[PDB]
Design a protein around this ligand. Sequence first.
Ligand code: 1N1
Length: 269
Amino acid sequence: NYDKWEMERTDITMKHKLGGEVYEGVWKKYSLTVAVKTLKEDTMEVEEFLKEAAVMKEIKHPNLVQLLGVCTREPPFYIITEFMTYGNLLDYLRECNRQEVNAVVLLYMATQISSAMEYLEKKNFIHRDLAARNCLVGENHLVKVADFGLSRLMTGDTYTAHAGAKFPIKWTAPESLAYNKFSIKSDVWAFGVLLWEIATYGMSPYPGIDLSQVYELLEKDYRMERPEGCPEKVYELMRACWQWNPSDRPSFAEIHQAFETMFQESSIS
Ligand SMILES: Cc1nc(Nc2ncc(C(=O)Nc3c(C)cccc3Cl)s2)cc(N2CCN(CCO)CC2)n1
């Protein structure tokens, strides 16, 4: 009945809708621009809305979108987070000045994301839809993973998604496609694809390839080619993420350490 995260809905003024349902609003007390997720008072997604709120309370990491407060006493239910200025990483990359957002910057963004994912790995969470679209950007190439796609692993290492669930085939690991099973390893695969998105400045993965065939191509060892101007080390990491066997994919700890060193090395140059 008492929750520290619960804030008065009074202290929030809405400014502008951003999608969906998400708004740019203002926490008036702190004169702070915030992001506010909400829902229609006629929805069955109330339970999962609240579950994700609860999850986000447990989450604390620089490269994970920070929860600020909630309004879960009566409709409309709010989840308030910090406001990421530039929106998602996909559109950012597509619209960016590539002279500004160059190689070392891409390395930096990958490093940040892998930090967030290592954190989740440690905390027994998995992200159900890890992609550039669900990474948000702030000033100085700050990247944060959107935490609404998070699921906690209560037992074991494998989250089974609800029966008949749609999933982004090109981002989805083959064991997830075949069995609806998501491990942190599945997220490692997805992160590989995200690396591809970053390197290509937001190209659609497996471009031109009919979705129906995708799985079958992966089974027969087809992987996306190294993007133009992508360092061979990075591509090697991408292929490592796309190992057929989940057990052969690296951990996000390994991945993050790799990108950390690579980034420092590029920073020297
Ligand atoms: C859709 C959108 N989001 C933006 N920023 C966001 N920051 C934080 C957000 C958020 O969703 N947090 C969150 C999470 C992660 C989980 C549960 C609950 C919540 Cl509340 S959404 C900015 C933006 N644009 C501004 C930049 N554009 C050019 C025009 O200047 C157009 C697009 N568009």
